[PDB]
Structures are given as structure tokens and as C-alpha cells.
């Protein structure tokens, strides 16, 4: 069939070669690698704080680098910056579009980002002489809804869209310096590495790709899930990451091993994962499910170590502070809860 | 609490007061999601946001059109709309099955299972012209049209053919069968026959949203 036969066959062999290489490299499973360590026991985490200012469901949240300030987006079309220690609303930013599916907290803390069904990433300046939060850069160029956005630095931001592409922008010029292509379905999440030289993205093709930011190429492609990937989170070491999909299973992929190390699922869990996160040490993997409850997984033993029950609707976002003090969980009941 | 901490707390209180004002503005507004096909004609009825006003009630209609053909993810954002407005092309029998499948997926969608659907069979004039002519037959794409007779409750419009009544009500009963095959009364389908020149669609949306929220209040008060 000319190309339709030749390229399909060469690929089919190449995929078989990758599978054989992974089988050869699979010397021993991580589960047995850790079958001797002490059980992490149960991590009972109590709702220490409850932030109630949003008017509808909360789609996303993000922590500041100082592990005290957090931003959050909601269906009411407003962006609210909270002081988690004192529950104070530091800012309330009205949004032009009320369908914002993501928000981002600049590591320097000067700016904030927001985007959604409007296919535009909006950057808001917090520290301005006028005294009010003002939009500074509206990044257009994506042909689909913006699933996620993360600040590389004060002038560079990496966004993932539902147009099957991720982009690296430059807020100064407002143009895409790099476009990452290769995903078959929508890119639902992206996670920046600790060194920020590369990032991973989970798409609706049940695959996650590792992109090198500088060269703009996909270094590796990881498969193993059977449903759309909704959540992605880089391991604190930076040499691994975890994915949360609608199969109701979480999987841990190692960059160097290029394969899944462990699947975090149980037979009675039939609800997809909306968000995942790691602790400072990377021992607990917190996953927010559709069953209105977040589970805390032992990242090395696959056994559920705790439940973050208390949210009365879907847990949409879930993030851990940079200092690991607390876990903030946003849900569709319009409330953010901080757990310690 | 320092003087600055007190001032910050006060500022947060004023932010909360502005949030309460926005709550008053936001609760009174009813959100409607406009879905349909490319040829459905939903434009007459990226994001094309509309805000109309019927009897002092604020409605906000959203026609998402800046995305790709894959809508299994961005459609979950509308889990809390008052109703989903589904527009179909009644004349195009070829894509009628595609419209039925989309309606079935929306109806049985885990998250859109609590959202009522206002159904707008749009191109009624085109459907009537096609039925009167011999251009195509419904039974080709739907063999069950043979064994189907106009419903007793069907109210024909004056001066209309009984065969046009048969066609339009069969097209409406396919959607109705899909809708009442499940859902156990949490959400309801509201079928309407529409024309491109119709001007009462706003009143229809008003009445049907009124019924939707009335039934919601009855159910939440345990009055069925």
C-alpha cells in the first residue's frame, strides 16, 4: 500500500523493538525492590483551613514559591489570591472569560496566569504602580482550549492546549518561541522538572511525552494507560513522574527506565483521577478522584495510606506547597481546603 | 493582630463584600450551553456569547465554536448550566443519526446527567419541503419509519400535510426515546419545532427553563 503499508510496518517493528528493550531492562519490579521497607502506615491529614470565597466550582489552584500565597480559578470568572495562613483574600481578579480551566503562580511571585476555553493565556501583573491587578500580556496563538500553563521564569511560560500541542512562549514579545507537537489528543496537563530544562505532558491519547524545552523535541514517549491522562506531576528528584488517568489508575514512569514502575489502583476504585501531586520526599502521592475523595498513595508500596475525605463534589485540583507543609485541594463545591 | 494585619483583614472583608455583590449578580443569571452541528443553524438561535433578557430574567447563552471535534473534556465545564440547548437539522437525514448519537452521549454523560436539554428541531421548513418532494425517504436511513404512526398527542399545524407531521414527529420521537430510555427523572428533554424565521425561541427558552427549575425545586423539596 506504498506509504500506508511501509511506514505502518516500520513503525510496528520499531514499537516491537521498544517493547523488547523495555522487557530486557525490566530487571525487577519496584514493588519487590521495596517489598522489605517499613509500611508508611496511615497519614491522617485533617482539614486545617477552608477558604470560601469562590462563587462556583473551582477548576485549578497553584501555590506560590513562598508556600503561603496561592491562586485559584473558578467558574464565576474570578481569580482569587489567598493568604493560606490567615484565610485573607489578598486579591480578587475579575476575568473576561468565565471558563478558565487553569491558573499559574509565577515562581518570582510578580505575575499570575490564567486561561481556558478562550484559547488565550492571560498574564496579570500583581506588583504594579497603579495598585490594582492589571492584565499585562494576552498570549494568543493556540487553536484549542488551554488545559494547563506553567511559568518557566518571569518572561517565559509553558502552556498546554487542547489543540494537541504544547507551546513555550515569551511574554515580552508575546510570540511562541517553540511549539511542541506529537500528541494525538488534547494535552490535559504539564509538569515542569525541578531543573526546568524539560517537562512532561499528559494527553488524551493515553500517553505522556517528555519534551526538551531548548531543542523543542520529544525525548521520550511513555505508554501504559488505556484512558485519557488528566493529571501529571514530576517526581521531586526530577528523574520520574506520575500520571493520573480516567482508567482510575495512577502510574509512575521513570525517565531513565522509560517504562511504568508501579500502578496505583484498586479493584473497587472505578473513578478517574483529576489531579495528582507528590510530597517533598516523593513518598506520598496524593491523587484527587471523581468520587469526591482524595487518596494518599504510598509511592513506593502502592498501598493506599490515607484518604483526604471532606469535599462534597469532584476534587478538581490538588497541589503541595514547595516547603511541603500543607496540601491544598480545590473541588467543585466552591471551597479550597488546606490539609496538614 | 498588628495594625497592618487588621488592615489586611479589613481589605479581605471588603473583597468579600464585592464577592457578595457579584454573587447577587451571578445567581440571577441563567447559563445555557448551545450545541449543534455545523449545518444545524444554531448560529441564528471562538466562543460566541449571547446575553438576552426575557421578563426581567437574565439568560447567558454560550456557543463554543473555537475547539476541535473532540468534546469529551471541555464539555464537563458546563456541569452546572441551567439547561443544554441542542440544535439539530431535521432536513438532513444523513446526519440525523450523528445528532442522535451526540444527544445520547450528552444524556448519558456522567457529568451532564443532571442537565436538562432543550431540543430545537431547526430546519422544519426544509424538512417539510424535502418530505413533500421525492428527494429522499426517511425509511432509507430509518427502516422503523415504516411501522410508525403519528402520536395521538401530536398537534399538526393548520394547512400542513399529515406526512410532514409523521416525519417531524418521528424525528422528535427518536430523540424522545433516547431521552426517556434513562435518566429516571433527574433531567428532562424539551422538544421544540423551530424555523429559521421564528422569533419566539427566547420565550420558549424562558418557559422551558422555568419548568426545569420548578421541577428542580420540587425535587429538592421532596415534592417530586
Amino acid at each position, epitope marked *: 500500500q506504498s506509504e500506508l503499508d511501509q511506514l505502518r510496518q516500520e513503525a510496528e517493528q520499531l514499537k516491537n523493538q521498544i517493547r523488547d528493550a523495555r522487557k530486557a531492562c525490566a530487571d525487577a519490579t519496584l514493588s519487590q525492590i521495596t517489598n522489605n521497607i517499613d509500611p508508611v502506615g496511615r497519614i491522617q491529614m485533617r482539614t486545617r483551613r477552608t477558604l470560601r470565597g469562590h462563587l462556583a466550582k473551582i477548576y485549578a489552584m497553584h501555590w506560590g514559591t513562598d508556600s*503561603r*500565597l496561592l491562586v485559584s480559578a473558578s467558574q464565576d470568572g474570578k481569580l482569587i489570591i489567598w*493568604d493560606s495562613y*490567615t484565610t*485573607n483574600k*489578598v*486579591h480578587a481578579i475579575p476575568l473576561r472569560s468565565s471558563w478558565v480551566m487553569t491558573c499559574a503562580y509565577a515562581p518570582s*511571585g510578580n505575575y499570575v496566569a490564567c486561561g481556558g476555553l478562550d484559547n488565550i493565556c492571560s498574564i496579570y501583573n500583581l*506588583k504594579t*504602580r*497603579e*495598585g*490594582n491587578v492589571r492584565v499585562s500580556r494576552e498570549l494568543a496563538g493556540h487553536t484549542g482550549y488551554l488545559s494547563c500553563c506553567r511559568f518557566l521564569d518571569d518572561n517565559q511560560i509553558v502552556t498546554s492546549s487542547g489543540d494537541t500541542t504544547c507551546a513555550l512562549w515569551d511574554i515580552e514579545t508575546g510570540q511562541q518561541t517553540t511549539t511542541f507537537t506529537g500528541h494525538t489528543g488534547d494535552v490535559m496537563s504539564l509538569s515542569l522538572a525541578p531543573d526546568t530544562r524539560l517537562f512532561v505532558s499528559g494527553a488524551c491519547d493515553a500517553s505522556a511525552k517528555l519534551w526538551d524545552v531548548r531543542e523543542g523535541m520529544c525525548r521520550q514517549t511513555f505508554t501504559g494507560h488505556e484512558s485519557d491522562i488528566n493529571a501529571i506531576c514530576f517526581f521531586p528528584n526530577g528523574n520520574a513522574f506520575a500520571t493520573g488517568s480516567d482508567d482510575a489508575t495512577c502510574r509512575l514512569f521513570d525517565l531513565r527506565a522509560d517504562q511504568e514502575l508501579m500502578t496505583y489502583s484498586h479493584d473497587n476504585i472505578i473513578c478517574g483521577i483529576t489531579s495528582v501531586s507528590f510530597s517533598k520526599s516523593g513518598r506520598l502521592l496524593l491523587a484527587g478522584y471523581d468520587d469526591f475523595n482524595c487518596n494518599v498513595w504510598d509511592a513506593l508500596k502502592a498501598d493506599r495510606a490515607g484518604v483526604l475525605a471532606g469535599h462534597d463534589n469532584r476534587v478538581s485540583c490538588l497541589g503541595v506547597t514547595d516547603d511541603g507543609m500543607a496540601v491544598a485541594t480545590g473541588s467543585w463545591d466552591s471551597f479550597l481546603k488546606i490539609w496538614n | 493582630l*498588628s*495594625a*497592618e*494585619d*487588621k*488592615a*489586611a483583614v*479589613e*481589605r479581605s*472583608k*471588603m473583597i468579600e463584600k464585592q464577592l457578595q455583590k457579584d454573587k447577587q449578580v451571578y445567581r440571577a443569571t441563567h447559563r445555557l450551553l448551545l450545541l449543534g452541528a455545523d449545518n444545524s443553524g444554531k448560529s441564528t438561535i471562538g466562543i460566541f456569547e449571547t446575553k438576552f433578557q426575557v421578563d426581567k430574567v437574565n439568560f447567558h447563552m454560550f456557543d463554543v465554536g473555537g475547539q476541535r471535534d473532540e468534546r469529551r473534556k471541555w464539555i464537563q465545564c458546563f456541569n452546572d448550566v441551567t439547561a443544554i440547548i441542542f440544535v439539530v437539522d431535521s432536513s438532513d437525514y444523513n446526519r440525523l443519526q450523528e445528532a442522535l448519537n451526540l444527544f445520547k452521549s450528552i444524556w448519558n454523560n456522567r457529568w451532564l446527567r443532571t442537565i436538562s436539554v432543550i431540543l430545537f428541531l431547526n430546519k422544519q421548513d426544509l424538512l417539510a419541503e424535502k418530505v413533500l418532494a421525492g428527494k429522499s425517504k426517511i425509511e432509507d436511513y430509518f427502516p422503523e419509519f415504516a411501522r410508525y404512526t403519528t402520536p395521538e398527542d401530536a398537534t399538526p399545524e393548520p394547512g400542513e400535510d399529515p406526512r410532514v407531521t409523521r416525519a417531524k414527529y418521528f424525528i422528535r420521537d427518536e430523540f424522545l426515546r433516547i431521552s426517556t430510555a434513562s435518566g429516571d427523572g433527574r433531567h428532562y428533554c424539551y422538544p421544540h419545532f423551530t424555523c429559521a424565521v421564528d422569533t419566539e425561541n427566547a420565550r420558549r427558552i424562558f418557559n422551558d427553563c422555568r419548568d426545569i427549575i420548578q421541577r428542580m425545586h420540587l425535587r429538592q423539596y421532596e415534592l417530586l
Partner: single-chain antibody
Amino acid sequence: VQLVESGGGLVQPGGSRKLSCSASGFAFSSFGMHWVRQAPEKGLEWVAYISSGSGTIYYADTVKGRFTISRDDPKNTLFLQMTSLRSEDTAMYYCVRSIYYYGSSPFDFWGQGTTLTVSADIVMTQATSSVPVTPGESVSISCRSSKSLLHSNGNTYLYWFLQRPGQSPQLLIYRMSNLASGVPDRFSGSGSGTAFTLTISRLEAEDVGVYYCMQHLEYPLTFGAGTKLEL
């Protein structure tokens, strides 16, 4: 940003005068406004404060009851109604903006001021009220406070201001350690409770003036007597 003050002038000891502060270039409704006076032979002295939305008003004990303060956010104007003046009220009144949230910089902008002539407190002492310095050499200026300004929340509420001759003062350091916007790194703020110092590296031009230290722990706002950095 621009704050305009008007109304100062010759007033008899018995009478009244209304002070106005026009706002331009910032969200006047979301800022808490202060009135800070300064006599020709005296340093700054905080006189009154009206919060954002007029939800909280404070006055200095010296003019408590005698003065009134108010704002007009729709008109972006700040009003200070003064009745039954005194011969001690001869001073230049400054309109100061300050917004309070976590990580904000209060007292960032000071209005040009209007000159008005009439025909339970924390004391801040600034040693070496007049010293000569040489450009290009580092200097250290220290003001100490009667009560420790640390609020057990890592908040030593001390503020540094620079009053160059012929213009309103500007905020240099807020919280004793944070440099404000538009202020060069050569300035350094450090110290502990009840003892703070200001360090300047590589002294240059546009630094000659009077250096003030102000506490914001509690509201009886008190300013140091001035340091008068001179060449």
C-alpha cells in the same frame, strides 16, 4: 501616580481650614490614606488615617477630636477638615497612600504637600542627628525603638524614609528588610527588636537629606527626629 494637596495658607488661630488631596494614577478606592505633617523645624508627625472604604479612622492624640478626616472615592479626593487651629499647627501636610495586604508596601507614595501656617506611645530616637559624610564611602544610620517591633510573625514593622531637601520623602525600606520599588540595592536594612540600623553602600548623589525611621507596629504612628545626612 500623582497626589495633589491644596488649602494651606495664612489662617488665624481661631478658625477652620479644609485640606484636599486629589488622586490621579492609582486605584484611590483600594488604598488607605494618611495625613502626615512636618513643621519647618520639626520632623514628620502622623496626624490621621482613613482606611480603604472609610471603614476605619484613626487620629493622633495631639489633634484627636479637633480634626476630621474623610475621602470621596468616586471623586478620588481626600479631605481633612480642621477646626480651631493652634499656633503649633504650622506645618506642611503630606497626603500618603498605603495599601495593606500580605507583602504590600505601605507608605510607598507621598504627595508633594501643602504648606499651612497659623498666626501609650512608642518613642523612636535617632542618634547622631547631624553628621558629615563623604560620597563613595559606606555609612550606617541607626534608630532604636522603646518597644520591640517584632510581632512574633517575623514582622519588625520599621519603615525608612528619605526626605531630600525640596521634595516629599519616599519609602526606602518597609518591614526593616524589604527594599521598595525604584530604590537601588545600595540601601540595606537590618536590625533586631528595639534596635535597627540603615546601611548605605557607595554613597552617591541624590542621597543628601534627612533619613527618618517610622514604626507601624500599632497605630500611634511615631517618626524619628531625623538624621540629616550631610556632605
